[PDB]
Amino acid sequence: SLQDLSKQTEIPYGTVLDSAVYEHVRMKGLNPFERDSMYSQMWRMINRS
């Protein structure tokens, strides 16, 4: 689905720069009042360097 993927680290993942998906993930990841805790994990993979 997606919930596990945020937790594994053997396969890296990413997306097309400055798509709407990239801004969507940047929006969900930083928000400390998100109820979920998947989105704020994924950002730490995508944003490397």
């Binding site: 929006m27 930083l30 928000n31 009042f33």
Partner: protein, 98 residues
């Protein structure tokens, strides 16, 4: 595009009663504005921010107001108790609905 001299007369009529009026311009790039807050403020300070948005006034172009209400609600910065007033001279019945 608002010319804040038009509300120069709140000053001597709300500093007296001692309310806590604050201003803040709303950008064209809303998402940059919102994300900079999450990027820069402490999680202590930011919890004193949601304490203010429980009341507001909007004074703006309705086509901006729609997108701003949608971004504020969608990022969960407000809940079922807020009471946002809106004022304008012209709003037609298409936009009252939206």
């Amino acid at each position: 595009e608002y010319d804040i001299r038009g509300i120069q007369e709140f000053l001597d009529k709300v500093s007296q009663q001692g309310m806590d009026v604050a201003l803040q311009k709303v950008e064209n790039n809303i998402n940059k504005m919102i994300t900079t807050l999450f990027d820069t403020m402490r999680i202590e300070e930011l919890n004193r921010y949601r304490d203010t948005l429980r009341r507001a006034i909007l004074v703006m172009n309705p086509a901006t107001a729609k997108s701003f209400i949608t971004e504020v609600v969608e990022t969960n910065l407000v809940a079922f108790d807020c009471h946002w007033i809106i004022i304008n001279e012209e709003i037609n019945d298409v936009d009252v609905q939206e």
